[PDB]
Subunit: 286 residues, 4 copies
């Protein structure tokens, strides 16, 4: 079972910094990340222009051997163009959010979007489902009804919703994206996890996976609860910005910054977070 | 009290068509539209490039005397740039959605976004609130606390939520954005309405306004109910794409197309919509 | 247009005090309440035994000329039984919540419940819709389909939702039950309001009704906002218990108390609430 | 890890039939049910009078060695009365929903409800959490703060929400109540499940438990998916009434019926369900 990192997009001086990005990717893949997922929500995907996603695709595919690229755009031609680009750069798969923002698009519109993406490339197309952010759900039955989905990332608190993709699409690779469900995902033998914490504590996720595989459910659960406490503190100050500071805290190198509306944490927020996780940090035998 | 059109963005072959747009704006403003609101949700704002939004700003300010440009972007630098551009082209105000898509941004991040817009321009900055599409609400209390909001457009079926902005911001111009609340907005004396149906039935909205002003409450209401039957059919088939077909059906000229993932309606959907609205339309006597 | 009070159920000791109830009914009906609605949510309906509701029926019909009895029970035989009892005591109508609590109920079960109710009496049966408390909505289209509904009380922040009942059911008496929409309800000419504040400020509700009729929209809105401030303070300490204390503050007599798990406000909560509404209270001229 | 049945309440004639009930309890306890949970949502608890719940308590404590009685009432005095009665009859624990139906009760009211319940008995008080039905959540933090909660049954699609009670109350016994999470609950080593399917397919739940315990984690998931198919079908016609028919289909004896507003299935619905679950039934064996 795989640890997939929905990797942060590392800005510095207003632009993408591929040196920060490459160092970060090479570190986390050394610590147990199997696959790099670029331009996911944790990577600020919908905030990135097509060219920024191309730059990120180049950086990810030159830093990691296994890369899935998130391609969604509210101009659907851009999703097709980037999917072809990712494929040419050696991505093992592409993924897409369903069309987001607009309420009450039709089922026909959603289906055409995904079918056009599948027609554009030969590599597997993944559904990246995230109803809290997207404002709609493409559930297991709908995903099967599309007729071309070969993988699912379900960023979702409902483990049963995620398991249902394995039921309706027995050949798809299915992953849950909730940090609170890493332990549970391995326990029920999903194909893997795509959790934001693979950015800052990949060795913890690997510890959970190891523990579950050894039958050590108590250790796995304990590691999970430690992770939950860290996530909880981070959510308190703006989770998406905090992920970057958590990388600095736990991995010890510069992680860059997000970009407005996802403004970087200020100095006072960074200091508060460092103290907030100091205890959980000391408890870590990984 | 004003009728404000959140005007459609008119594409041809996935490219912006400013002639279709200009003809449409000229027509609805001759039929009772007081103000043109460009790149709102009905105008596919989040789907438009910055280049497209600048072109749309040029075309709207050329075709209309009173223009508000909606500037939101998930790259905040782009919101600031377009707000300054809009001001330079003579927009009377700019509006923005709160940062959307991303769940759990912090209050500081949201406040910074709006405050940076207000500091970027001298013309009024409006809150454009649309919780169903944005995934968060900036309520009247929150809008007061921003400390620079001079207008609100509230695309919201809770009319008291919209009225609360007049309570907390007595100097602000406050509009409700729901088609189902045009009659109600005029009856409670909001500053006006920003309803998508100003695109396809602006004469019907002016008729509602006239009836309320005449104390003809029963007429205003029966006109509202006719509009509600039309909105219902349109929603059934996919509302955002449906608006374009309704413009053609009710106003009698070409309206262009939306762009995918907001794909244009297909022939069967259009035929269905035409049959669906035919009854209600006939019961109209303006 | 009517002011309908969803009257509080006055307990004293551990049990219903029908005398306190009669007195309260008499005072508010002398101050503008047109109809008394017994055992609604504000009257703690779902917490009352059949015997308590029968007792309210007797006391209300003896103290008021126009009485509607709310009869919902999760034993449908008690609803049928009480509806018959209310008719026999001279109630002008009965109302029911749809079946509540249970999430997994079919359209057929809901329709059967309302149709059996309609068969049981010859007086009008109202739908009492309150989705936030009930956990389900019976919307205008569904209410028409039931085929026997003659009135609706919609406790709902969506004025559009309530207006839809007048569209689908032109001969029904339709009331909105939100305190925040009293002004709006009279402005759009619903048949009336069934607002909790008729317990403690029936003269304010009448003042709003008078102001709308006179066309003094600005006074109507101003009175609405004062009411909103009062409701907001009450919601802070527990609205259902707070209504009783607001009756005491504004009407000057003992209102009795609710019963747990709706526990009466404690002395500190009462002192806080008195102080919280003091300014709005002094600003009240009528 | 335990299988707890939220047992159906068995009506015949519109009245309780304690002999159908006894036969049912005895059968399911012989096929792997460890504990009987009486008057839960599956048992129509909120629909039952205090006397009916006492009668159910008698029948359960006569037919089974281990009984937990669900005691919630919207008259808290009745919750206390029943808890004392359950203890007198030899129940090993009582549980309660939080106060339901009423929106926006205060934290003080909810805490007083639970603490008063704990002080009435010397047997343990469990929290029975079911946010979808109750309209409010008492999460793990809130549960710990109550200070007297000894067990938790969380009917919730969010497994991380359930797991949190083990984080905060590691001494409490914690169960998840969603049928779609039986496999997952055993996999993460909750103390067990309280799933409605214990009524009709207890042997399937015991098979899932066995398979998780071997490590045929993949056969466990396969049995769960079969259960998910059957649940899917019952949900389609109205789950609460359908549970009774599923008992007849899979266990082959008379199950009684629910009582309206939870009306029994009609002959047509029953025929539809039997055909719908025939395939699943055929692949069962066990």
């Amino acid at each position: 079972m795989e640890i997939v990192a929905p990797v942060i997009t590392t800005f510095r001086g207003g632009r993408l910094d591929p040196e920060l990005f490459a160092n970060h990717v090479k570190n986390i893949t050394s610590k147990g990340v199997d696959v790099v997922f670029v331009a996911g929500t944790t990577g600020l995907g919908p905030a990135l222009s097509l060219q920024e996603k191309m730059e990120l695709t180049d950086a990810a595919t030159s830093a990691a051997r296994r890369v899935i690229v998130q391609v969604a755009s509210l101009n659907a031609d851009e999703a097709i163009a980037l999917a072809k680009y990712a494929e040419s750069r050696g991505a093992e798969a592409v993924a897409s959010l369903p069309p987001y923002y607009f309420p009450r698009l039709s089922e026909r519109q959603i289906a055409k979007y995904f079918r056009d993406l599948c027609s554009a490339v030969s590599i597997p197309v993944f559904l990246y489902n995230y109803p809290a952010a997207v404002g709609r759900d493409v559930d297991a039955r709908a995903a099967k009804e599309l007729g071309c989905i070969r993988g699912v990332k379900d960023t979702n608190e409902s483990l049963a919703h995620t398991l249902a993709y394995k039921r309706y699409l027995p050949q798809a690779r299915v992953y849950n994206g909730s940090d609170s469900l890493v332990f549970a995902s391995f326990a029920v033998r999903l194909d893997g996890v795509v959790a934001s914490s693979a950015n800052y504590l990949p060795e913890l996720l690997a510890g959970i996976r190891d523990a579950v595989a050894a039958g050590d459910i108590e250790r796995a659960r304990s590691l999970q609860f430690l992770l939950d406490e860290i996530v909880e503190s981070a959510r308190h100050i703006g989770y998406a910005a905090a992920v970057y500071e958590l990388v600095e805290i736990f991995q010890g190198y510069e992680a860059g910054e997000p970009r407005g509306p996802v403004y970087p944490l200020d100095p006072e927020e960074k200091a508060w977070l460092r103290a907030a996780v100091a205890k959980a940090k000391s408890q870590l035998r990984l």
